[PDB]
């Protein structure tokens, strides 16, 4: 097992790393360093200073979440180092790269687990929201944030890279999953950590009306394609509609006193974006494209119900994450025997042609896109008000 370094050890080691690099390059300040080493160290310094500022402010019980962020930041830079290497250059011969890995205590025989890598980037990506007003990207960037030393282009670039790393980490964990879970699914123990903003769900009117809209769209599909049942449709389209039906059905079994209707509508909405995303990929488009696809009844139908064209990327992330949280709870066997696994029998076991891992992977892709579109819009917004 990989034991994480304590926070004080990371701080002292990084401060030494900066000194070593500055001494080797014979510079006084890191702002005089060549690219991309300059911005990379300016980023880590900014992160560290902001971490220390939060520690001396909030006075937390455990510094575990703070270590997770620093680990994510240092690993993000290591990734940036690899991307900026020449065609023949090796990372093992990079001073900064080797210094960071040594500071985190990572070698060839000592690497963090899949879960630890995810927590690193999940922690950093949440930590990056400090640049937004009230920690919300809906309100744009702050006039003064902890990454002010960096340019808007670099902020977007690092954020984009960080979101892609979390996606890649999740996808690697999904690829190693096995479908030999013997445990039974438990909806009775499914409780949301934080309640959802009802304003995000008010466009779907109610849980009954949303179910009615879904059921009506399926009827319109069967009518337009002149078939009696869903199975008569294509293997792809059939699995998608049965996925939505299973989703809506499995949510009705749960009492409203154990799971609020607003939470149910959010979960169902996230499932709709997944199906909407799958169909969009069939047309060679991005899963979250707002372009109208007239050739598809379902994609057009789901877009109408979801109000996808008018909805912002932030609200979409919440809905998609809500569906992701429910699926992973019902289908994935979590620990605390050893390791995670897909239950051999779940909600989607009877659905022919259903590809679970593909769906969970698509979720991570749409999540990343929502986050990337959020920072891009804020960077572009900040650029305009600076150029006026």
UniProtKB/TrEMBL annotation:
Coiled coil: none annotated. It comes from the Bacteria. Gene3D superfamilies: 1.20.1440.330. This is Type IV secretion protein Dot.
């Amino acid at each position: 097992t990989f034991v994480l370094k304590e926070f004080d050890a990371l701080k002292s080691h990084f401060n030494d790393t900066v000194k070593i690099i500055l001494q080797r390059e014979k510079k006084d300040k890191i702002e005089d360093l060549p690219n991309p080493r300059k911005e990379e160290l300016q980023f880590l310094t900014a992160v560290l200073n902001q971490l220390e500022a939060k520690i001396d402010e909030l006075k937390p019980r455990s510094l575990a979440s703070y270590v997770h962020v620093f680990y994510g930041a240092m690993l993000l830079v290591c990734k940036d180092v690899e991307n900026n290497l020449r065609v023949m250059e090796k990372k093992e011969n990079s001073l900064l790269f080797t210094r960071l890995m040594d500071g985190m205590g990572i070698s060839d025989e000592n690497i963090p687990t899949s879960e630890q890598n995810i927590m690193f980037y999940r922690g950093l990506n949440k930590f990056l929201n400090f640049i937004y007003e009230s920690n919300d990207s809906r309100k744009g960037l702050k006039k003064e944030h902890f990454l002010q030393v960096l340019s808007l282009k670099k902020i977007y670039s690092l954020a984009k890279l960080s979101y892609e790393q979390e996606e890649a980490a999740e996808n690697n964990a999904l690829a190693k999953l096995t479908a030999d879970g013997k445990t039974k699914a438990n909806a009775n123990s499914f409780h949301v950590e934080k309640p959802i903003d009802s304003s995000i769900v008010e466009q779907f009117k109610s849980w009954d009306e949303m179910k009615g809209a879904l059921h009506q769209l399926i009827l319109d599909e069967l009518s337009d394609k002149n078939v009696a049942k869903i199975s008569a449709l294509s293997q792809a389209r059939s699995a998608q509609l049965k996925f939505l039906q299973t989703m809506a059905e499995q949510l009705d079994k749960i009492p409203n006193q154990s799971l609020e209707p607003s939470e149910k509508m959010a979960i169902l909405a996230g499932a709709m974006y997944i199906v909407r995303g799958q169909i969009a990929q069939e047309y060679g488009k991005d899963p979250l494209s707002n372009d109208k696809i007239s050739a598809t009844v379902i994609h057009t139908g789901l877009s109408t119900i979801l109000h996808a064209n008018a909805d912002c990327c932030e609200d979409k992330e919440v809905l998609i994450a809500a569906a992701n949280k429910f699926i992973r709870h019902m289908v994935i066997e979590r620990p605390e025997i050893t390791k995670e696994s897909v239950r051999e029998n779940n909600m989607f076991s009877d659905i022919a042609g259903f590809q679970l891992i593909s769906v969970l992977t698509l979720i991570q892709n749409m999540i990343k896109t929502c986050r990337t579109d959020a920072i891009e819009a804020c960077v572009t917004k900040r650029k305009e008000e600076l150029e006026a």
